[PDB]
Write an enzyme that holds these catalytic residues in place. Sequence first.
Site, PDB file in Angstrom:
ATOM      1  N   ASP A 142      14.476  14.753  15.182  1.00  0.00           N
ATOM      2  CA  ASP A 142      15.260  14.767  13.935  1.00  0.00           C
ATOM      3  C   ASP A 142      16.241  15.933  13.956  1.00  0.00           C
ATOM      4  OD1 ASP A 142      16.132  13.941  11.385  1.00  0.00           O
ATOM      5  OD2 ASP A 142      14.307  14.576  10.385  1.00  0.00           O
TER       6      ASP A 142
HETATM    7  C1  ZIO Z   1      20.410  10.430  15.333  1.00  0.00           C
HETATM    8  O1  ZIO Z   1      21.325   9.845  14.470  1.00  0.00           O
HETATM    9  C2  ZIO Z   1      21.163  10.022  13.062  1.00  0.00           C
HETATM   10  C3  ZIO Z   1      22.516  10.123  12.462  1.00  0.00           C
HETATM   11  C4  ZIO Z   1      22.479  10.430  10.999  1.00  0.00           C
HETATM   12  O2  ZIO Z   1      21.982  11.727  10.818  1.00  0.00           O
HETATM   13  C5  ZIO Z   1      22.263  12.459   9.635  1.00  0.00           C
HETATM   14  C6  ZIO Z   1      21.032  12.956   8.873  1.00  0.00           C
HETATM   15  C7  ZIO Z   1      20.045  13.684   9.844  1.00  0.00           C
HETATM   16  C8  ZIO Z   1      20.289  11.786   8.124  1.00  0.00           C
HETATM   17  O3  ZIO Z   1      18.968  12.165   7.842  1.00  0.00           O
HETATM   18  C9  ZIO Z   1      17.957  11.500   8.578  1.00  0.00           C
HETATM   19  O4  ZIO Z   1      17.880  10.170   8.109  1.00  0.00           O
HETATM   20  C10 ZIO Z   1      16.772   9.462   8.714  1.00  0.00           C
HETATM   21  C11 ZIO Z   1      16.727   8.102   8.126  1.00  0.00           C
HETATM   22  C12 ZIO Z   1      15.515  10.214   8.487  1.00  0.00           C
HETATM   23  C13 ZIO Z   1      15.608  11.564   8.966  1.00  0.00           C
HETATM   24  N1  ZIO Z   1      14.313  12.373   8.792  1.00  0.00           N
HETATM   25  C14 ZIO Z   1      13.976  12.556   7.442  1.00  0.00           C
HETATM   26  C15 ZIO Z   1      13.173  11.749   9.467  1.00  0.00           C
HETATM   27  C16 ZIO Z   1      16.731  12.263   8.333  1.00  0.00           C
HETATM   28  O5  ZIO Z   1      16.850  13.596   8.808  1.00  0.00           O
HETATM   29  C17 ZIO Z   1      21.021  11.308   6.829  1.00  0.00           C
HETATM   30  C18 ZIO Z   1      20.748   9.810   6.670  1.00  0.00           C
HETATM   31  C19 ZIO Z   1      20.556  12.085   5.609  1.00  0.00           C
HETATM   32  C20 ZIO Z   1      20.931  11.608   4.198  1.00  0.00           C
HETATM   33  C21 ZIO Z   1      20.229  10.491   3.687  1.00  0.00           C
HETATM   34  O6  ZIO Z   1      19.935  11.790   3.210  1.00  0.00           O
HETATM   35  C22 ZIO Z   1      22.372  11.719   3.743  1.00  0.00           C
HETATM   36  O7  ZIO Z   1      22.949  10.738   3.299  1.00  0.00           O
HETATM   37  C23 ZIO Z   1      23.086  13.055   3.891  1.00  0.00           C
HETATM   38  C24 ZIO Z   1      24.145  13.221   2.820  1.00  0.00           C
HETATM   39  C25 ZIO Z   1      23.721  13.159   5.252  1.00  0.00           C
HETATM   40  O8  ZIO Z   1      24.681  12.136   5.477  1.00  0.00           O
HETATM   41  C26 ZIO Z   1      24.384  14.497   5.634  1.00  0.00           C
HETATM   42  C27 ZIO Z   1      23.772  15.801   5.112  1.00  0.00           C
HETATM   43  C28 ZIO Z   1      25.231  14.532   6.925  1.00  0.00           C
HETATM   44  C29 ZIO Z   1      26.085  15.735   6.910  1.00  0.00           C
HETATM   45  O9  ZIO Z   1      24.386  14.561   8.083  1.00  0.00           O
HETATM   46  C30 ZIO Z   1      24.465  13.688   9.176  1.00  0.00           C
HETATM   47  O10 ZIO Z   1      25.232  12.744   9.245  1.00  0.00           O
HETATM   48  C31 ZIO Z   1      23.194  13.614  10.013  1.00  0.00           C
HETATM   49  C32 ZIO Z   1      23.642  13.536  11.454  1.00  0.00           C
HETATM   50  O11 ZIO Z   1      21.671   9.546  10.274  1.00  0.00           O
HETATM   51  C33 ZIO Z   1      20.482   8.978  11.017  1.00  0.00           C
HETATM   52  C34 ZIO Z   1      19.560   8.115  10.263  1.00  0.00           C
HETATM   53  C35 ZIO Z   1      20.419   8.939  12.504  1.00  0.00           C
HETATM   54  O12 ZIO Z   1      19.038   8.945  12.960  1.00  0.00           O
END
Ligand code: ZIO
Length: 300
Positions: free
Chosen positions: A199
Site C-alpha cells: 500500500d
Molecule cells: C497501486 O495503485 C493504487 C493507485 C491509487 O492509489 C491512491 C491511494 C493510495 C488510494 O488509497 C488506497 O485505495 C485502496 C482501495 C485501498 C488502499 N488501502 C487502504 C488498503 C488505499 O491506500 C485512494 C483510492 C485513496 C482515496 C480513496 O480514499 C482517495 O480518493 C484519495 C483522495 C486519493 O485519491 C488521494 C489522497 C491521491 C492523492 O492518492 C493517490 O492517487 C494514491 C496513489 O488507488 C489504488 C486503489 C491503487 O491500488
Amino acid sequence: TVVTTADTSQLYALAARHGLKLHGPLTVNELGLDYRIVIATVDDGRRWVLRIPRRAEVSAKVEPEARVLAMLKNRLPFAVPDWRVANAELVAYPMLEDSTAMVIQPGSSTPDWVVPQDSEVFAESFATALAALHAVPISAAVDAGMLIRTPTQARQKVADDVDRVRREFVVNDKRLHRWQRWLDDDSSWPDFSVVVHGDLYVGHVLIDNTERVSGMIDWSEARVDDPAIDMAAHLMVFGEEGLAKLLLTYEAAGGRVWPRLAHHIAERLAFGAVTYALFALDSGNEEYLAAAKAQLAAAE
Ligand SMILES: CO[C@H]1C[C@H](O[C@H]2[C@H](C)[C@@H](O[C@@H]3O[C@H](C)C[C@H](N(C)C)[C@H]3O)[C@@H](C)C[C@]3(CO3)C(=O)[C@H](C)[C@@H](O)[C@@H](C)[C@@H](C)OC(=O)[C@@H]2C)O[C@@H](C)[C@@H]1O
Ligand SMILES: Nc1nc2c(ncn2[C@@H]2O[C@H](CO)[C@@H](O)[C@H]2O)c(=O)[nH]1
C-alpha cells in the site's frame, strides 16, 4: 461544556488496559472504514498512535501484521511503527513524528501538499529505501508467517481479482481487454517475487525535514509478491519522468529489474481500478461503490 468528537474517558480506559496512560492533547480520525486512528499524548510526554480495530474481522489481522513489523524492524534502514501494544482491541505505537510525504486534511479529496517532483533528495532516497525493502530475504518473510506469492501465484491473484470484478460489476469492454492482454503478456511479468509494502504511496512514506525518506507506515498489505506493486503509485504521483528516475536509482541501489518493468508498472497502475472496485464492494459503502462503478464502466 463542549461537545468533542473524541471520547476521552473511553479512550483513556482502553489505553490504560494496555499499559498506556493518556494525558494531554489528542486528535481523532474516524473516517477509516476498518480502524479509528487517534494520535494521543501519553504521560511519557510522547505522542502515540492508537490504531483501534472496529470489528472482529479487522482485529483478526493484528497478530499477523505484528509479526511482519517485528521482522522488518532491524532489516530496514528507515523506521516502521513499533507496535509496543498489539492485540485485538488496540494497536499502539509511539508516533513517528516525521511528516508523511503527502499532507491531506481528513475528509478532503485534495492534499494540502505533496513532496515536489523536483525534490532530488526525496526521489533518490525513496528509490534506495524501496531497493532496501525489496532486498529483505524471502526466508525472513516465511519465518515471520507472511503471505507468500510465487510469480505464478502473483499472476493468479491478479487474474482472480479481475474475474471477481467481472462477476460483480459491468466493465468497459476495452478495460477488460486491457487487463486480459496484460495477464496473457508473458514478457510483462516478473520471474521473481519480493517483500512488498503493498500500500505504498506518498501518504504512507515519512520524510525528515530535508525530504529524505525516514520511515514507512500502514503495512497491512505487506506480503511477498510482484515488486511493481510498490511502484505504481509513484508513477501516478510523479509521472513517467519520476518513474524513469526511480528505476535508474533502484537498479543502481541493487534492486532487481527486468526489461519490461516500466511497462508492467503502468499496467499495475491501470489495475488499480480493480483494486478500488473490490475495496468498494467489500466495504459496502455506497459512495465508494458509485465511484467504482462509474470508473469501471468508463473508457480509459
Ligand atoms: C497501486 O495503485 C493504487 C493507485 C491509487 O492509489 C491512491 C491511494 C493510495 C488510494 O488509497 C488506497 O485505495 C485502496 C482501495 C485501498 C488502499 N488501502 C487502504 C488498503 C488505499 O491506500 C485512494 C483510492 C485513496 C482515496 C480513496 O480514499 C482517495 O480518493 C484519495 C483522495 C486519493 O485519491 C488521494 C489522497 C491521491 C492523492 O492518492 C493517490 O492517487 C494514491 C496513489 O488507488 C489504488 C486503489 C491503487 O491500488
Ligand atoms: N507522521 C505520521 N503519521 C502517521 C503515523 N501513523 C499514522 N499516521 C497517519 O494516520 C494515518 C492512518 O494510519 C496515516 O495514513 C497517516 O496519515 C506516524 O507514525 N507518523
